[PDB]
Structures are given as C-alpha cells and as structure tokens.
Design an enzyme around this catalytic site. Structure first.
Site, short mmCIF file in Angstrom:
data_model
loop_
_atom_site.label_atom_id
_atom_site.label_comp_id
_atom_site.label_asym_id
_atom_site.label_seq_id
_atom_site.Cartn_x
_atom_site.Cartn_y
_atom_site.Cartn_z
N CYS A 110 -38.95 20.79 4.21
CA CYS A 110 -37.61 21.08 3.62
C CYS A 110 -37.29 22.60 3.64
CB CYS A 110 -37.53 20.47 2.25
SG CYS A 110 -38.69 21.13 1.05
N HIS A 159 -38.08 20.01 -3.38
CA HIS A 159 -37.22 19.75 -2.22
C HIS A 159 -36.06 20.75 -2.24
CE1 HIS A 159 -35.95 17.46 1.25
NE2 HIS A 159 -34.81 17.06 0.70
N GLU A 171 -31.16 18.10 5.60
CA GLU A 171 -32.46 18.22 5.00
C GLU A 171 -33.55 17.78 5.96
OE1 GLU A 171 -32.84 15.43 1.70
OE2 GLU A 171 -31.91 13.80 2.76
#
Length: 199
Positions: A110, A159, A171
C-alpha cells in the site's frame, strides 16, 4: 472498530525496527532515495518546460504546477494497475521484491505504491504508512479531494490509499492481490486524510 475489516489487521511494512525500516535508514539508502526523487522531480518539471537552477519537497513545485503534479502522481500510480501485491514491495521507479511474505514476489504494497507515485514529481514521502499519515496536512474526510492520501488502522498503520475523488481510491490491496481502484471504505478510516500537495 479501528481497522479496515476487509484487509488483515497487521501493522504494515517499514514500521520501526522491521527489515525494511533498517535497510532504508542507512546513510547511503537515504541519500540514494533523496537524489533519485530530485532526479524524478527534474524530469517532471522538464516535461513542463521548467529547469530550476542555482541553489518532502512539495515546496519545490511551483504553485502554477501543483494541480498538474497531483494529476501526474495519480497517472503514475494508475500506470501500475494490476501489478501484484507484495508486502514491502516497491522502489521509487517501479515494483520490487518485498520483505517477509513479499520477499520473493515483485510488486507493491500500500505504502510502496503511493511513495513510488509521489516520487515522480520530486516529493519523497516516508516508507511506513504510519509515517506517511503525518507527512502532510491533516484534513477532515468531508473536505478530502483528489490526490489526498486515505489511511486505515491505528495511526494509519494498516493501509494507505490514493483518493481519486469520485468516491474512489487507488490502492495496492492485499485482498485484491494487486493494484486496483476501489470504492472508498468508511470502516477503519483514520480521523483525517492527509494532503501531500496543496492545490
């Protein structure tokens, strides 16, 4: 709850003392990243007909070109759509092998993805998502705009995603197994988004 339920509740790669953090804290690695970022920023500004002279780096971008920089970063991240997920994966120039579960898989995680993307306009954000969270200006999610970084988990440690506007985020997703675009998720979001480039 404090985590995104759709992804493993693990503190992400590059956290203090982990393999990736120690690898990156060397003077030589730190200098290599700083110069490479400068080289990329020169490339971005050159493509606009700008060559800076004389004596994160978001301040090096002329105001005139801040919007363009955000678009270039998103384009750059977009170029990586479908690249596999790899924990700890990513260099400033593309996917790479990661660490731990990612050690033999070329890809992005991420925070790897978004650090690669920003580096394209000469802005170097930290390697760890929790550090990225603090690398710009905190904005209430209601006031988020295209280009902001969105974080999940305590202190944004789980994240990080790149908000596109349009209720969408780009993402590197462990659940998808790849770089993808997804609807923004509310569950597990941090109190703020983070604005890296102001426009």
């Amino acid at each position: 709850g404090q985590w995104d339920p759709t992804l493993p509740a693990l503190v992400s790669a590059g956290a203090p003392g982990d393999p990736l953090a120690v690898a990156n804290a060397s003077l030589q690695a730190t200098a290599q990243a700083t110069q490479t970022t400068l080289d990329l920023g020169r490339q971005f500004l050159g493509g606009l007909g700008i060559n800076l002279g004389g004596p994160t780096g978001a301040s090096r971008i002329p105001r005139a070109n801040a919007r363009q920089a955000v678009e270039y970063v998103i384009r750059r991240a977009g170029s990586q759509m479908g690249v596999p997920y790899s924990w700890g994966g990513g260099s400033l120039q593309g996917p790479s092998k990661g660490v731990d579960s990612g050690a033999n898989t070329v890809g992005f995680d991420c925070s790897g993805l978004v650090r690669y993307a920003f580096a394209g306009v000469g802005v170097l954000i930290p390697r760890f998502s929790g550090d990225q969270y603090n690398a710009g200006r905190h904005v209430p999610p209601a006031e988020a705009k295209r280009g902001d970084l969105i974080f999940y988990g305590p202190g944004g440690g789980q994240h990080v995603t790149l908000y596109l506007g349009n209720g969408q985020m780009l993402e590197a997703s462990g659940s998808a197994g790849k770089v993808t675009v997804s609807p923004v998720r509310k569950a597990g979001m941090t109190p703020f988004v983070t604005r890296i480039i102001e426009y």
